[PDB]
Amino acid sequence: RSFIYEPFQIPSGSMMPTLLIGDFILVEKFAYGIKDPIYQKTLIETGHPKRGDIVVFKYPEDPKLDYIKRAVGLPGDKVTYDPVSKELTIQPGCSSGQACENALPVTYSNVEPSDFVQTFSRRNGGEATSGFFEVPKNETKENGIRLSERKETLGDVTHRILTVPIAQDQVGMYYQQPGQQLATWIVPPGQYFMMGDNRDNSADSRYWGFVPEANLVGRATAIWMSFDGLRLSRIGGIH
Numbered sequence: 001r002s003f004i005y006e007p008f009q010i011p012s013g014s015m016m017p018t019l020l021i022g023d024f025i026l027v028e029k030f031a032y033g034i035k036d037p038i039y040q041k042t043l044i045e046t047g048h049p050k051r052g053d054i055v056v057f058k059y060p061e062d063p064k065l066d067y068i069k070r071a072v073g074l075p076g077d078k079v080t081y082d083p084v085s086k087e088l089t090i091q092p093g094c095s096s097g098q099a100c101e102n103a104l105p106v107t108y109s110n111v112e113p114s115d116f117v118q119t120f121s122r123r124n125g126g127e128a129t130s131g132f133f134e135v136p137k138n139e140t141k142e143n144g145i146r147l148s149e150r151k152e153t154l155g156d157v158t159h160r161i162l163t164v165p166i167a168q169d170q171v172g173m174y175y176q177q178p179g180q181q182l183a184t185w186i187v188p189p190g191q192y193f194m195m196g197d198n199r200d201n202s203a204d205s206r207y208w209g210f211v212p213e214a215n216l217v218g219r220a221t222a223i224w225m226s227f228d229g230l231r232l233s234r235i236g237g238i239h
């Protein structure tokens with residue numbers, strides 16, 4: 001088996017705190033080669049995302065851009081997002097409108113202030129995100145909101161998420177799947193529901209739908225370098 005690796009720059013903060021703007025990651029492409037009975041005839045196989053994997057894929061609405069999000073919903077999952085508690089409920093194999101009772105273990109730790117403050121430009125009275133800043137927890141920044149952080153465990157995968165405590169999704173702008181109420185989705189076969197870890201700063205599947213497997217590029221495996229300026233402490237695994 002011969003895997004192909006591709007590095008990727010992280011220019012946006014939608015996967016914070018897991019991936020920060022300036023991180024440079026390594027991605028293992030899903031498509032790989034295998035040597036036929038030994039040997040000749042290099043054959044091409046394709047792996048698939050596991051729940052919780054951080055995945056690079058071609059943005060469905062404009063395949064020319066590569067997005068990076070977490071695959072929280074797998075083919076067949078009934079995914080529900082509570083915009084108030086900002087928590088996911090996932091029910092594997094509940095894809096036939098049946099009243100399912102099974103449920104993937106999804107648990108959350110207590111909300112705590114994160115290291116980041118999100119600032120906004122005061123454009124003539126209104127607001128527009130101007131960036132994210134790491135700010136000591138005992139300090140404040142004007143026109144900035146301290147983000148909250150907690151751990152989300154999807155089945156047996158635990159990772160962090162950041163929430164903007166003064167914000168709430170407008171469910172009315174979600175992508176609404178035929179036959180489903182707002183904020184509930186049933187992942188189609190061979191497709192995926194993607195969500196960014198910076199939950200209130202992520203234009204993901206909630207807004208535009210599923211990612212077809214054909215659009216998948218690969219799985220993030222490491223932070224190879226990071227610059228904000230060198231941040232060598234971030235090189236290593238993604239957690």
Ligand SMILES: *C(=O)[C@H]([C@@H](C)OC(C)=O)[C@H]1NC(C(=O)OCC=C)=CS1
Pocket residue numbers: 008009010011012013014015019066067068069196201202203204
């Ligand atoms: C979040 O920002 C991911 C990042 C981590 O992808 C990178 C940096 O490769 C992608 N998601 C978004 C997003 O939700 O923004 C949509 C609005 C334009 C952008 S890149």
